[PDB]
Design a protein around this ligand. Structure first.
Ligand code: CA
Ligand code: NA
Ligand code: NA
Length: 443
């Protein structure tokens, strides 16, 4: 039966190299795994003992001094054409966007990483990186980088957290620094201290779109953290959600902070807090899943969502999780309801589909409510009954075409492993046009 070995890496950024997967997160923490199931913890905090950057407090002295911090926030490590590993590091004071972002380079994924210097700052009292006075209602906090190649081999970096929103910069593929003259770069969304951070871009060759993943809400147990996605034909936008809303329009109301209500309507919502547990039956359950990265396996065409999450009843404890992603008929990804255990999309038979399901509806809100299950039943006559009504059918090998309460959803049927109950389960995972995700798990 499947084996898991857990690690804690907040804000994990996935990278595959040398036949092995690594995640690099905040606090100079990191872990590795060969199979995305058994992880080995490598580092956990910023100290002069951390082997990724020896004597880190001297090596990145200028960043800690600017940011007035003893830690680092959410790193990204990306391999460039010279074969070397470039870590995009950043620190932030924490109570304000007083931050610096820089890059360090290593010959080997596990270090040592050598500082090349700071290249962006936020939170200055005067002139900012774009030649205008720094203003956090429109300018970024210089944290949460994702440095990536587009389908043509051009290098970009997307970044941002709260403050003025999410931005993208053209990067130098020889040095790892931004090309000159761009300021903070091009704005993709955001404004007025919206609760939106952790951008990540993944291309899908089959659908021919770039997917911009984001985290909405606050990270903590009462924060309503949830993972959302939008897409564009180009890496630098414009990005839209499944209803065709332009992501550029998303921001808080002028003169406010953390206006969740104005931003909720925008983006496809893939996953938020939920539990399959009931009084009578154990189940899986997350609180505030978010700050994701994503991986595309060119050998198989399979995609994976990698993220941290908290849990019902475990306070602020967090661990890394991985869920497989599937593109639906309209070119939007749905997440497997259970963590990755080596499952793949296979042929599904009608006999396997019929029966009773526990249903999670992730909705479109930012909410600290842990979503709970209701029970439905997929009938042999193609109706759905029980605590909701609708219809189901299958397209081809495993495509789920489901109607619930007069809304139409599309995704997949998928047999997988429930690691809490330690049983196989038939599931479905689907998405409607409003960007609402629904998961079914069969009883
Ligand atoms: Ca990240
Ligand atoms: Na420390
Ligand atoms: Na990377």
């Amino acid at each position: 039966k499947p084996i898991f070995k857990e690690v804690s890496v907040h804000d994990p950024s996935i990278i595959e190299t040398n036949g092995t997967f690594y995640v690099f997160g905040s606090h100079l923490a990191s872990a590795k795994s060969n199979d995305l199931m058994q992880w080995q913890q490598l580092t956990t905090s910023v100290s002069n003992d951390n082997p990724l950057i020896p004597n880190v407090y001297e090596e990145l002295k200028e960043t800690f001094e600017w940011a007035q911090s003893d830690t680092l926030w959410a790193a990204d490590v990306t391999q460039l054409a010279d074969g070397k590993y470039y870590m995009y590091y950043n620190a932030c004071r924490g109570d304000s966007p007083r931050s610096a972002m820089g890059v360090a380079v290593a010959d080997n994924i596990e270090g040592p990483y050598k500082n090349k210097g700071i290249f962006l700052k936020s939170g200055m009292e005067g002139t900012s990186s774009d030649g205008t006075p720094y203003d956090a209602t429109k300018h970024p906090n210089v944290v949460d980088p994702h440095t990536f190649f587009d389908k043509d081999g051009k290098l970009w970096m997307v970044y941002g957290s709260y403050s003025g929103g999410i931005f993208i910069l053209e990067m130098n593929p020889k040095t790892g620094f931004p090309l000159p003259g761009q300021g903070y770069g091009k704005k993709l969304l955001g404004g007025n201290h919206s609760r939106i951070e952790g951008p990540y871009v993944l291309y899908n060759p089959d659908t021919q779109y770039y997917y911009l993943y984001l985290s909405y809400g606050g990270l903590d147990a009462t924060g309503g953290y949830n993972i959302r996605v939008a897409r564009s034909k180009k890496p630098d936008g414009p990005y839209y959600d499944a209803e065709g809303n332009p992501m550029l329009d998303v921001r808080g109301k002028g003169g406010t902070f953390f206006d969740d209500r104005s931003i909720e309507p925008y983006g496809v919502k893939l996953m938020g807090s939920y539990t399959f547990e009931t009084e009578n039956e154990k189940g899986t359950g997350y609180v505030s899943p978010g700050h994701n990265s994503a991986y595309y396996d060119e050998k198989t065409g399979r995609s994976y969502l990698i993220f941290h999450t908290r849990f019902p009843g475990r306070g602020e404890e967090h661990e890394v999780r991985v869920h497989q992603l599937f593109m639906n008929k309209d070119g939007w990804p749905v997440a497997a309801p259970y963590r990755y255990a080596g499952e793949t999309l296979k042929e599904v038979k009608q006999k396997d589909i019929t029966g009773t399901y526990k249903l999670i509806q992730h909705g479109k809100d930012i909410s600290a409510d842990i979503k709970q299950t209701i029970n439905i039943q997929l009938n042999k006559n193609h109706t759905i009954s029980g605590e909701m009504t609708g219809t189901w059918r299958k397209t081809g090998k495993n495509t789920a075409d489901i109607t619930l309460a007069g809304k139409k959803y599309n995704g997949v049927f998928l047999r997988q492993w429930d690691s809490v109950r330690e049983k196989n389960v038939m599931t479905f995972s689907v998405l409607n046009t409003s960007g609402e995700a629904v998961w079914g798990s069969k009883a």
